[PDB]
Structure 1
Amino acid sequence: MKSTFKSEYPFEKRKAESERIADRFPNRIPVICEKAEKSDIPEIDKRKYLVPADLTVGQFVYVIRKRIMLPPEKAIFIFVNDTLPPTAALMSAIYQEHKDKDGFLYVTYSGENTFG
């Protein structure tokens, strides 16, 4: 599968969990990454990333690397909308134009530097 939040749970519920994260930390950016099948990296436990609006993709690329705790010899890359944003890009500017109708964000990481 790819996502069970929309399948397993309703679309509102999701937007709900955010409604609170917004009332609690409206200065954050709950990015919802999704394992990239294409890649061959080891799956994660869950997909959740609460970063500030002052952090850049760079950091994120690292955060994820934590969830997968990849080796220092490997190199993972983040992708959005079947794209590959820079590390300088701000998670606020990106999510700003990458934001979904549900609010959350949809990104995917892959051990390879390819969009698929």
Structure 2
Amino acid sequence: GSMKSTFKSEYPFEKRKAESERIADRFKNRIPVICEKAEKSDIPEIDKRKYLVPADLTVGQFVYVIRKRIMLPPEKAIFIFVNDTLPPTAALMSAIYQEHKDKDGFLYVTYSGENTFGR
């Protein structure tokens, strides 16, 4: 038939579009943040493409959720850096976005388990 078989296994939750509605009202202030994966990293490519980040989001908050996003174990950890830059946790995304604001308005961030830097 044309219809579809509803099942919990498939978990159409995310497949639903109504979600965007509630999120559109619950989260008014948001910025287009796109996390990319480096080529010289052993970190797996995250499934979630777009990341609805609020204008009041902080680096620390993003890093905390990140671990839960990739279901990464405690044995290891990862961090997000923009243009080879790793700002503090207090650093507000809304502030870092205006600085690294793409030529056509767009936040660019990279996630990995390394910084390739030293002390």
TM-score normalized by the length of structure 1: 0.70
Structure 1 residues 71 and 53: CA distance shift in structure 2, 3 A: same
TM-score normalized by the length of structure 2: 0.68
Give the alignment's Cα RMSD to 1 decimal.
8.4
What is the Cα deviation at residue 103 of structure 1? 1.5
What is the Cα deviation at residue 20 of structure 1? 15
Q: Is the 8 A contact 2:35 2:51 kept in 1?
A: yes
Secondary structure (helix, strand or coil) at the match of 1:107 reads strand
Aligned to 1:31: 33
Q: Structure 2 stretches of 5 or more lacking a match? A: none
Q: Structure 1 stretches of 5 or more lacking a match? A: none
Structure 1 residues 7 and 19: CA distance shift in structure 2, 3 A: farther
More helix by share: 1
Q: Greater Rg, structure 1 or structure 2?
A: 2
Secondary structure (helix, strand or coil) at the match of 2:7 reads coil
Secondary structure (helix, strand or coil) at the match of 1:7 reads coil
Secondary structure (helix, strand or coil) at the match of 2:16 reads helix
Q: Is the 8 A contact 2:29 2:56 kept in 1?
A: no
Aligned-partner Cα distance in 2 for 1:61–1:3: 38
Structure 1 residues 17 and 114: CA distance shift in structure 2, 3 A: farther
User: How many positions carry a matched residue from both structures?
Assistant: 116
Question: Matched residues, percent identical?
Answer: 99
Structure 1 residues 41 and 94: CA distance shift in structure 2, 3 A: same
